Amino acid sequence: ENLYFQHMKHGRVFIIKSYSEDDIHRSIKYNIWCSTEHGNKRLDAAYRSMNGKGPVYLLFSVNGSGHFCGVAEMKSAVDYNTCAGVWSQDKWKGRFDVRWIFVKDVPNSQLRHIRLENNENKPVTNSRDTQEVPLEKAKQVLKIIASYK
Ligand SMILES: Cc1[nH]c(=O)n(C)c(=O)c1N
C-alpha cells in the first residue's frame, strides 16, 4: 500500500491551464510562473493564507493537449510589478516562484473519473485555469499522477 497522500489535511491544490508549450518549458527551467490577473489573485490569497502550514500544489496541463504535464509547488507570493513580455503573450502581469516537483505526461483518461463537486461535478480534466480542487479529490489526483508509468 501507499497511504502517503490520504494522510494530510493542510494543503490546497489548483489546476493550471497553459496555452503554450514554451511557457511550460520556461517554468520548468526557471521555477517561475504567472497567471492572469484574477488567477494570480486567487493563488496569492491561497498562498498567503496558508502561512507555510502546507503546500499549494499546481497541477499543470497544456490546453487541448489531452494530458497533464506535471506538478509544482507555489513558493512565493505574487509580485505584480515585474518585467513585461517574458511569457508567450504579454498579457500576463507579474511573477511568483514555484518549484517543479514532478514532470511527467499523465493522460486525461487516467484522471477523468475524478469529478469536482465545487465545479458542477465536472471531470477534473475539464477544468479551467486556477480551478481549485477539493483536498479529498486532490489526494486522489496526486496518487494517480505519482503512480502513472
Ligand atoms: C504563463 C501563462 N499564464 C496563464 O495564466 N495562462 C492562462 C497561460 O496560458 C500561460 N501560458
Side-chain angles (χ1 to χ4, degrees), residues 1-2 4-5 8 10-37 39-40 42-52 54-88 90 92 94-98 100-103 105-111 114-127 129-148:
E1 79 205 0
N2 176 358
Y4 185 86
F5 280 122
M8 246 288 278
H10 306 290
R12 297 181 69 179
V13 180
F14 294 82
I15 305 305
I16 297 293
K17 298 298 284 181
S18 176
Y19 285 111
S20 166
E21 174 76 4
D22 297 350
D23 289 350
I24 296 296
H25 284 151
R26 186 166 302 276
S27 190
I28 292 162
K29 172 143 189 203
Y30 296 112
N31 271 337
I32 51 176
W33 193 243
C34 188
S35 187
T36 61
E37 197 208 349
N40 277 344
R42 275 221 281 281
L43 299 176
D44 200 38
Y47 184 79
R48 302 181 155 270
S49 73
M50 187 84 15
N51 274 315
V56 176
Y57 285 133
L58 310 180
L59 316 183
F60 279 81
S61 168
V62 171
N63 281 318
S65 68
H67 57 272
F68 278 68
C69 57
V71 179
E73 182 178 348
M74 194 173 175
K75 286 299 208 185
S76 85
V78 175
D79 187 335
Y80 282 93
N81 294 294
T82 70
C83 190
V86 304
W87 304 101
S88 65
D90 309 17
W92 302 296
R95 194 192 61 241
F96 58 90
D97 299 338
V98 303
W100 283 77
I101 59 195
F102 199 44
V103 181
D105 289 341
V106 184
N108 278 7
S109 69
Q110 306 288 311
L111 296 159
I114 311 182
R115 278 154 181 282
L116 305 191
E117 63 262 39
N118 59 323
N119 189 36
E120 307 167 25
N121 217 253
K122 298 184 181 172
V124 64
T125 46
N126 294 354
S127 303
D129 187 52
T130 68
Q131 173 66 64
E132 187 167 359
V133 185
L135 191 43
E136 91 280 350
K137 300 311 203 322
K139 295 167 154 173
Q140 293 164 15
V141 173
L142 288 164
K143 189 158 175 181
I144 288 164
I145 286 169
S147 76
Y148 183 75

